[PDB]
Amino acid sequence: NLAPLPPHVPEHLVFDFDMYNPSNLSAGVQEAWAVLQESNVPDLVWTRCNGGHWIATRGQLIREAYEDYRHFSSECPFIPREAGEAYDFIPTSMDPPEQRQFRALANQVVGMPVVDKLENRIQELACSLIESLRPQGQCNFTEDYAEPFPIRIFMLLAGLPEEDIPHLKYLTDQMTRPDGSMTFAEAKEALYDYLIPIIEQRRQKPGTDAISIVANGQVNGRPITSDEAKRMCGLLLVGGLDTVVNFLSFSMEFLAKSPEHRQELIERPERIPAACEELLRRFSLVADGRILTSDYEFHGVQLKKGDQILLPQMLSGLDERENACPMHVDFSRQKVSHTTFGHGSHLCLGQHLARREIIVTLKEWLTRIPDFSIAPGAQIQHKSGIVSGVQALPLVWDPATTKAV
Numbered sequence: 036n037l038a039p040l041p042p043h044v045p046e047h048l049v050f051d052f053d054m055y056n057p058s059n060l061s062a063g064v065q066e067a068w069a070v071l072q073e074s075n076v077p078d079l080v081w082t083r084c085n086g087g088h089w090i091a092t093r094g095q096l097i098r099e100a101y102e103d104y105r106h107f108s109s110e111c112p113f114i115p116r117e118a119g120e121a122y123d124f125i126p127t128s129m130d131p132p133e134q135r136q137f138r139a140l141a142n143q144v145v146g147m148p149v150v151d152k153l154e155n156r157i158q159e160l161a162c163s164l165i166e167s168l169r170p171q172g173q174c175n176f177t178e179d180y181a182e183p184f185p186i187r188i189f190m191l192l193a194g195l196p197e198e199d200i201p202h203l204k205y206l207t208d209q210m211t212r213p214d215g216s217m218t219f220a221e222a223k224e225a226l227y228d229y230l231i232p233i234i235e236q237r238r239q240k241p242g243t244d245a246i247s248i249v250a251n252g253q254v255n256g257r258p259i260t261s262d263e264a265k266r267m268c269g270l271l272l273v274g275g276l277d278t279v280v281n282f283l284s285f286s287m288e289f290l291a292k293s294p295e296h297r298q299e300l301i302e303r304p305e306r307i308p309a310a311c312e313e314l315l316r317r318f319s320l321v322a323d324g325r326i327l328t329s330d331y332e333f334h335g336v337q338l339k340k341g342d343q344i345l346l347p348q349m350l351s352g353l354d355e356r357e358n359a360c361p362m363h364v365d366f367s368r369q370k371v372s373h374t375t376f377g378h379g380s381h382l383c384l385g386q387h388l389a390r391r392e393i394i395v396t397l398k399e400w401l402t403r404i405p406d407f408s409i410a411p412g413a414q415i416q417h418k419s420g421i422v423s424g425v426q427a428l429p430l431v432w433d434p435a436t437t438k439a440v
């Protein structure tokens with residue numbers, strides 16, 4: 036289902052990439068995207084899929100576009116347009132200067148100082164989940180760790196019942212990796228139905244949780260509105276539920292396949308932080324975009340007002356112009372160049388949280404379960420979307436090679 040080419044699009048710029056179902060998905064999600072970076076592909080292409088939109092393919096262009104909010108607006112950041120249109124998260128669907136006030140508040144809730152305070156729980160949960168798995172000699176890493184670990188921490192931060200996970204996780208998934216079961220607006224609405232009563236409750240009787248702080252916050256000298264609080268919280272939920280979860284699975288799949296990388300981390304732990312960056316580069320997984328505010332000629336291509344453009348954060352670090360041998364995992368790269376957590380004014384506020392969760396997992400897993408692999412005859416399937424993911428990750432190990440702590 037290709038959309039008819041608009042008049043302004045030169046036929047030579049056409050490359051029919053489906054962000055939701057790329058062609059070489061079997062080879063892995065990052066590799067399926069990386070087709071965009073082959074020599075036969077222009078830097079800036081138009082795809083007829085998902086209603087027609089531009090895609091910048093090179094880290095240089097992606098960064099420029101991300102910097103330029105005047106031309107590339109966040110108003111409609113999701114493809115397809117109906118999703119971008121329904122999209123009303125804060126701060127994400129706002130441009131500076133307006134964005135700034137909302138960002139400052141979101142920052143109060145997820146930033147460094149929160150990470151620092153939660154550090155002990157993160158460590159406690161990771162150790163507990165791992166120890167609980169260790170003697171089994173097998174899990175479903177996606178269901179058994181990648182989900183619970185980051186989610187439970189978010190749940191704790193947000194002061195929401197663990198019981199809500201399944202319902203919430205379903206709705207968030209619908210947003211990044213649409214099933215066809217529900218449209219964006221429907222999904223958005225169901226999440227909002229969820230949050231409304233809670234926000235209400237927390238404006239009346241505040242707690243110390245993230246929702247309480249957002250609901251009762253100050254933006255541009257006045258109080259946040261209920262609707263504004265709803266729209267921030269909605270974003271927080273998607274970030275909490277859908278990011279760290281998927282990343283861990285890519286990373287753990289790689290480690291399961293690469294003894295020499297595991298060993299490296301076991302023997303030279305000083306390297307963890309560097310490896311975490313390298314994994315964030317190689318297993319980058321986010322792709323959103325912007326909307327043209329006006330007619331604009333960008334690197335010799337004429338963009339029309341209202342045109343959406345995908346600026347895949349995933350792609351920058353995979354670009355050979357940015358990193359030599361991109362598909363190769365090297366913990367000792369002199370410079371790890373990525374835009375995994377975004378670029379420009381929308382840089383990921385939850386990054387500090389994400390990094391802490393990753394580093395803990397690496398350290399803690401490797402400590403107890405140094406030797407593991409993918410289950411014999413399991414085929415690992417990746418899934419593409421706004422946030423890419425791994426369907427299931429069956430791991431096996433010999434308990435006798437594990438270490439209790």
Ligand code: HEM
Nearest residue numbers: 126127138274275278279282321376377381383384385389
């Ligand atoms: C592996 C982990 C994650 C990755 C790769 C990631 C990636 C991103 C990207 C690419 C953006 C910018 C999007 C844009 O420019 O359209 C961003 C923004 C954002 N993310 Fe993260 N994210 C992660 C984890 C999280 C977590 C754990 C949270 C906390 C709930 C979260 C909260 C946010 C917020 C609040 C923003 C918006 C900042 C603003 O618009 O000013 N992220 N994320």
Ligand SMILES: CC1(C)[C@@H]2CC[C@@]1(C)C(=S)C2
Nearest residue numbers: 127273274321323421422
């Ligand atoms: C990856 C996303 C595009 C999705 C919606 C905003 C975003 C930056 C976070 S955090 C979740």
